[PDB]
Amino acid sequence: ITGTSTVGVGRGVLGDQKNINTTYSTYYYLQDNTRGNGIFTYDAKYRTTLPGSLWADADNQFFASYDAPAVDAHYYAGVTYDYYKNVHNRLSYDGNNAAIRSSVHYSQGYNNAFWNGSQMVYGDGDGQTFIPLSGGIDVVAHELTHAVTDYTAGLIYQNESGAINEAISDIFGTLVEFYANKNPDWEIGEDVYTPGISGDSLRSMSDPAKYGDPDHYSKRYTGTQDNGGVHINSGIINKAAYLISQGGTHYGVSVVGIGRDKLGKIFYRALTQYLTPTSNFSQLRAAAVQSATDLYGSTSQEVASVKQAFDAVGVK
Numbered sequence: 001i002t003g004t005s006t007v008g009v010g011r012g013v014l015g016d017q018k019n020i021n022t023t024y025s026t027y028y029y030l031q032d033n034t035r036g037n038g039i040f041t042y043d044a045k046y047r048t049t050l051p052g053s054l055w056a057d058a059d060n061q062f063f064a065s066y067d068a069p070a071v072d073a074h075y076y077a078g079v080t081y082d083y084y085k086n087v088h089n090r091l092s093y094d095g096n097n098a099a100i101r102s103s104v105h106y107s108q109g110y111n112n113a114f115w116n117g118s119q120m121v122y123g124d125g126d127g128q129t130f131i132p133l134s135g136g137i138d139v140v141a142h143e144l145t146h147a148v149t150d151y152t153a154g155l156i157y158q159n160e161s162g163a164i165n166e167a168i169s170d171i172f173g174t175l176v177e178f179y180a181n182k183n184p185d186w187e188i189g190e191d192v193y194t195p196g197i198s199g200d201s202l203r204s205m206s207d208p209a210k211y212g213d214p215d216h217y218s219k220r221y222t223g224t225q226d227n228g229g230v231h232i233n234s235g236i237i238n239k240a241a242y243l244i245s246q247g248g249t250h251y252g253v254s255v256v257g258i259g260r261d262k263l264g265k266i267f268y269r270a271l272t273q274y275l276t277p278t279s280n281f282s283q284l285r286a287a288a289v290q291s292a293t294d295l296y297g298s299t300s301q302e303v304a305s306v307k308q309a310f311d312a313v314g315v316k
């Protein structure tokens with residue numbers, strides 16, 4: 001909407017206070033004009049019609065319990081935009097500052113979040129399995145990264161390409177979590193998963209097997225559930241990414257870590273210059289090796305470490 005840029009204040013899902021960019025025209029709307037062509041946050045009102053209504057507030061204060069998921073979706077979309085712009089020189093998900101839209105309060109007791117082809121969508125969770133999912137910065141960045149993937153590599157959402165698609169979202173979700181630097185880790189969704197259980201998460205990149213996911217190609221799932229295991233086989237690639245960044249010895253194969261920043265550069269380049277809609281794991285290895293070669297040289301430690309990591313997870 002047309003109005004003047006303002007700054008509201010509120011509390012997120014975890015009870016933390018933060019400032020948010022809003023727009024004033026009669027009401028204060030969750031519309032951040034400071035980033036690209038805007039970040040817009042909508043109320044789905046417990047229903048499934050999307051996007052719902054652009055979030056409107058009378059006083060620019062967002063401290064109500066109902067406000068919390070909107071505050072976080074809006075704010076973390078901002079952080080994710082900043083990461084892509086500042087770190088990778090990418091302007092929004094399409095590279096041309098496309099408007100970023102999110103809806104919160106989607107459905108009732110909805111234990112998931114997704115990119116629907118056009119926008120991000122967040123359930124509130126059922127209160128036991130999840131609290132409102134926009135409370136997780138890794139979750140928000142995971143979702144926006146699906147949009148980035150769809151506009152770039154276009155990885156088909158099934159089987160190996162789909163598992164790469166998922167891993168890319170977990171990798172950048174995690175790198176954005178580190179970028180924000182609040183309780184960062186290599187786990188996925190820990191901030192919003194199972195409020196009654198401390199120390200768990202949906203997936204682990206450092207040890208995918210902790211939550212039953214494969215950490216070696218020999219353990220890949222080849223059934224039909226979960227689009228051919230896209231959230232399961234992602235563990236194999238997540239493990240490789242973790243090893244590239246942090247190093248370690250995995251099934252006897254030692255990897256020299258090169259750090260998060262280089263992991264991000266290598267995978268961002270692979271995603272945007274080499275991967276295609278049908279890339280499989282072997283092709284990702286080749287794309288990552290080539291990306292590291294472009295950035296650091298064929299004889300570099302970085303290239304050697306990428307090879308070691310894929311060797312460690314059984315991908316040739």
Ligand SMILES: CC[C@H](C)[C@H](NC(=O)[C@H](CC(C)C)NP(=O)(O)CNC(=O)OCc1ccccc1)C(=O)O
Nearest residue numbers: 111112113114115116117133139142143189202231
């Ligand atoms: C409990 C939910 C699982 C952890 C898992 N979901 C996830 O891992 C994440 C959310 C976490 C980061 C919190 N959601 P996602 O974006 O991967 C769900 N994906 C999805 O719904 O894709 C199907 C689709 C939906 C709309 C249009 C095209 C394709 C799943 O859907 O299996």
Ligand SMILES: [Ca+2]
Nearest residue numbers: 057059061062
């Ligand atoms: Ca208010």
Ligand SMILES: [Ca+2]
Nearest residue numbers: 183184185190
């Ligand atoms: Ca964390």
Ligand SMILES: [Ca+2]
Nearest residue numbers: 138187188189
């Ligand atoms: Ca995390």
Ligand SMILES: [Ca+2]
Nearest residue numbers: 193194195197
């Ligand atoms: Ca928990």
Ligand SMILES: [Zn+2]
Nearest residue numbers: 142146166169
């Ligand atoms: Zn996903």
